[PDB]
Ligand binder design. Structure first.
Ligand SMILES: [K+]
Ligand SMILES: [K+]
Ligand SMILES: [K+]
Ligand SMILES: [Mg+2]
Ligand SMILES: [Mg+2]
Ligand SMILES: [Mg+2]
Ligand SMILES: [Mg+2]
Ligand SMILES: [Mg+2]
Ligand SMILES: [Mg+2]
Ligand SMILES: [Mg+2]
Ligand SMILES: [Mg+2]
Ligand SMILES: [Mg+2]
Ligand SMILES: [Mg+2]
Ligand SMILES: [Zn+2]
Lengths: 225, 132, 343, 103
RNA sequence: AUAUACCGCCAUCUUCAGCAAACCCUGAUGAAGGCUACAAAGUAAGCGCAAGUACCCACGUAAAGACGUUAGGUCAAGGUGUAGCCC
């Protein structure tokens, strides 16, 4: 009797709004441009599945179309906020060691999880053996870098799909986005780009968790009286 | 390869007790002796007779409590007293255990001409140390 | 001598001879085999040849509120106790001899087609009672090894399905055949395809595909046609829930290629709703049993096109000579259209 | 006298349930392709063969033009054609009686 | 009689370090394969090694030493399957 009203006022209400958390106010094409998000790899490194998201090549250096990035980033941030609102487990994954420390801190601060270390065979597809039969896997995996250190796709991209976990991923021009649920074309190398991404996801996640508490608290106060 | 008193490895499904899991070289290191008497001490006599009595008592109790013994017997001798300590299961009715205790204590006391007492500890199932 | 006697376990371990160079390499075969028997099974503590009645051990301790005394069954009544134990012994032997047989597979000595039951319940209280498991191939694989020579392992192919569109297959590999069965069937339930069915009985359209060297041509059929397909396809179709289909397998008849080739083609079939959405037109079904009545099976969810689909006077579609040769009465085969059991 | 009653009893439902009486029957034959005719008869001089057909194996099943619920099991519900004998495994003798009772 | 039916107790490589399971992943779900530490699919357990213990130490020496190999040895330690003898 009271559960249907809970799920309707709290879980189903956010899904009726196009931007329930107002993640569009967090970034702009200019803010992305200042972080050098449009800078891609050289044309010789281009992946053919990234061609739709490329604005062009400036002297053999690919430029990422930030108009698309802004639209893709809006969806990825929106999905991430909704999953944080629903109290889903969010796991950040990246093998780029220049940013391992930064990413681990961002995860700890937002109350989520980070895996920046060597990824052992079967963390996702054999988790019950590795962790225990009652282990809960992540509900969302965010890749700040989708490639490993030998320039191949991070194994967790395939293994997240195998375990039916949606993935958000920054996809540079040499990356393969086919299996990434919510890809965001953007520069994955420059510290300004990576720092921006960590601020946006950290803020999206932190806002959605605070929104969940506000709604719950209001729903309880009104319930008693 | 050595064979003596070694429960060989299986597929991980054979339950063994603590005693069965320890080869002879662990005797006096990880496991104690199943009989304690003075016959094997330096300068002591009658080790031959104490040994035959122990072999009989183990066979006697195996066939007197058929299917009930959950581990090897522990035989203790103090003075002329003989104490038999056995770990048994909880399948036989208590009346049958009291009959067999009264019967065995009496028969063994007249056979070996000494006061014999039987101490029974019951366990719901054989205690498993590891699965070899 | 009493001291030379051993326990039953020691006596059976020796007499059975299950460990030894004979049993290591199966150097000894067993048409006649010593079978272990539990000789303490029907034995009652306190019962002996003399027929003594010990109060508290084999007879009740108290009778009519008084403690019973030592007594001995007379020769006649003791004789009946012994006879009753012999009959109970042969009766126990007879009941064990009786066992319920299992239905064979595609052939008497074949594993193919035999049901293995539902996959085992998962660790987290997960259950698959709705799923049935079928064996498709059991192979003996022989591996040459550096020190141990030719070793024998088992490769099993099994298919699982719930009969409502959810079906999968998996290979299992183990030294023991039963272990290979458990691995395959439990793995297959985690690799389930969903197969779309027209009216929950047939495929949506004719499917012709090649997987490696195995060709499979499948035809959509009406109700009552049954499964006229390679026996392995019949088995898989029952697991998926397809009741009416024709299939012809050509080229290499490799069970694995056929299984994964079949699942690839059934998982990539376009439904009528997908066709309507793709072309923004109505999908209209004409049935000869219903005359000229147009039966709309699917309508586009989005806007409905106003321009008719172009009418190419002659379609440039590739045809199967076998299909055409049959429609023209030029296909002669003694093996086609033979009477067979209901499938 | 009232053959349609057997199909309404509890004994019938326990033995066959809601499937046709021939659902679980399988012919024994060599090869993958069976002979194109079933056996002539399962009852030969009052003796029953080892693997009697679905009709002959149950003596309470009576092929009669009034026991329409049994007859329907040997007619295709979608096409109205009478199954040929190899379809269900009934002997030639009982298939003719089924065809005459159905007609 | 049969160690070429076995238990029991052992020789041997062993003055070895490997063996057998439960899973996971790659190869189009072919026979097969599964390691890179500035790490790229392997892993939670068992047995052996190791550790520990005995002897005078943490050294040494004992002991230990899996699975498998030689149908290795022993029916004459004892027991025992099968076959045979019972003036
Ligand atoms: K031997
Ligand atoms: K012997
Ligand atoms: K012998
Ligand atoms: Mg990059
Ligand atoms: Mg040695
Ligand atoms: Mg046969
Ligand atoms: Mg030998
Ligand atoms: Mg010491
Ligand atoms: Mg040492
Ligand atoms: Mg030594
Ligand atoms: Mg050691
Ligand atoms: Mg020899
Ligand atoms: Mg002998
Ligand atoms: Zn018949």
């Amino acid at each position: 009797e009271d559960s249907t009203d809970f799920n309707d006022k709290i879980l189903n209400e956010p899904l009726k709004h196009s931007d329930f958390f107002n993640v569009k106010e967090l970034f702009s094409v200019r803010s992305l441009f200042d972080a050098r998000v449009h800078l891609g790899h050289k044309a010789g490194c281009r992946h053919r599945f990234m061609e739709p998201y490329i604005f062009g090549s400036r002297l053999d250096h690919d430029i990422i179309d930030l108009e698309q990035t802004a639209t893709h980033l809006q969806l990825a941030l929106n999905f991430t906020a909704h999953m944080a609102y629903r109290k889903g487990i969010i796991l950040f994954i990246s093998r780029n060691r220049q940013f391992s420390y930064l990413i681990e801190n961002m995860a700890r601060d937002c109350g989520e999880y980070a895996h920046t270390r060597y990824f052992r065979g079967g963390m996702l597809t054999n988790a019950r053996l590795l962790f225990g039969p009652t282990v809960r896997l992540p509900d969302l995996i965010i890749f700040l870098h989708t490639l490993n250190n030998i320039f191949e796709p991070h194994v967790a991209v395939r293994d997240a799909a195998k375990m039916n976990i949606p993935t958000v991923g920054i996809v540079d021009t040499n990356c393969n986005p086919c299996l990434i649920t919510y890809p965001v074309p953007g520069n994955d190398d420059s510290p300004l780009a990576v720092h921006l991404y960590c601020r946006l996801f950290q803020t999206a996640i932190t806002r959605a968790k605070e929104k969940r508490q506000q709604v719950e608290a209001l729903y309880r106060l009104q319930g008693q009286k | 390869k050595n064979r003596a008193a070694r429960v060989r490895v299986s597929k991980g499904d054979k339950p063994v007790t603590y005693e069965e899991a320890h080869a002879p070289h662990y005797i006096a290191h990880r496991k104690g002796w199943l009989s304690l008497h003075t016959g094997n001490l330096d300068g002591e006599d009658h080790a031959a007779e104490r040994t035959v009595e122990d072999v009989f008592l183990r066979k006697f109790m195996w066939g007197t409590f058929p299917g009930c013994l959950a581990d090897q017997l522990v035989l203790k001798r103090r003075g002329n007293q003989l104490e038999i300590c056995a770990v048994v299961l909880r399948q036989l009715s208590p009346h049958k255990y009291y009959f067999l205790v009264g019967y065995s204590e009496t028969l063994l006391s007249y056979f070996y001409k000494c006061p014999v007492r039987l101490h029974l500890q019951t366990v719901p199932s054989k205690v498993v140390y590891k699965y070899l | 001598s009493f001291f030379t006697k051993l326990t039953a376990d020691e006596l059976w371990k020796g007499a059975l001879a299950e460990t030894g160079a004979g049993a290591k390499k199966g150097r000894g075969k067993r048409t006649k085999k010593k079978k272990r028997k539990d000789l303490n099974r029907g034995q009652i503590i306190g019962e002996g040849r003399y027929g003594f009645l010990w109060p508290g051990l084999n007879v009740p301790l108290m009778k009519n509120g008084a403690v019973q005394t030592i007594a001995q069954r007379s020769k006649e009544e003791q004789e009946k106790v012994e006879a009753d134990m012999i009959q109970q012994r042969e009766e126990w032997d007879r009941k064990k001899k009786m066992k319920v047989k299992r239905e064979r597979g595609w052939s008497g000595n074949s594993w193919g087609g035999i049901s293995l039951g539902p996959p085992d319940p998962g660790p987290c209280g997960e259950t698959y009672e709705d799923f049935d498991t079928r064996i498709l191939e059991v192979r003996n694989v022989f591996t040459m090894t550096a020190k141990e020579g030719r070793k024998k392992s088992i490769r099993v192919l099994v298919a699982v399905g719930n009969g409502k569109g959810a079906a999968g297959f998996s290979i299992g590999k183990a030294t023991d055949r039963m272990d290979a069965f458990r691995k395959a069937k439990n793995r297959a339930v985690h690799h389930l395809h969903y197969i779309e069915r027209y009216e929950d009985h047939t495929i949506f359209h004719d499917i012709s595909l090649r997987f490696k060297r195995t060709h499979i041509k499948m035809k959509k059929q009406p109700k009552g046609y049954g499964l006229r397909c390679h026996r392995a396809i019949i088995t898989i179709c029952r697991l998926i829930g397809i009741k009416d289909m024709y299939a012809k397998v050509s080229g290499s008849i490799n069970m694995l290629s056929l299984t994964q080739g079949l699942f690839r083609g059934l998982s990539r079939q376009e439904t009528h709703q997908q066709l309507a959405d793709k072309k923004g037109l109505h999908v209209v079904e004409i049935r000869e049993e219903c005359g000229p009545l147009p039966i709309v099976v699917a309508s586009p969810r989005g806007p409905l096109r106003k321009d008719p689909e172009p009418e190419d006077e002659v379609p440039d579609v590739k045809l199967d000579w076998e299909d055409v040769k049959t429609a023209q009465g030029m296909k002669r085969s003694v093996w086609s259209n033979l009477k067979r059991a209901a499938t | 006298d009232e053959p349609w009653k057997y199909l309404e009893s509890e004994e019938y439902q326990e033995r066959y349930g809601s499937r046709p009486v021939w659902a679980d029957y399988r012919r024994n034959h060599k090869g993958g392709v069976p002979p194109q005719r079933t056996r002539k008869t399962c009852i030969r001089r009052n003796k029953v063969v080892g693997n009697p057909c679905p009709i002959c194996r149950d003596h309470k099943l009576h092929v009669d033009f009034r026991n329409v619920k049994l007859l329907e099991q040997f007619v295709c519900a979608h096409t109205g054609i009478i199954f040929y004998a190899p379809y269900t495994g009934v002997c030639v003798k009982q298939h003719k009686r089924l065809t005459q009772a159905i007609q």
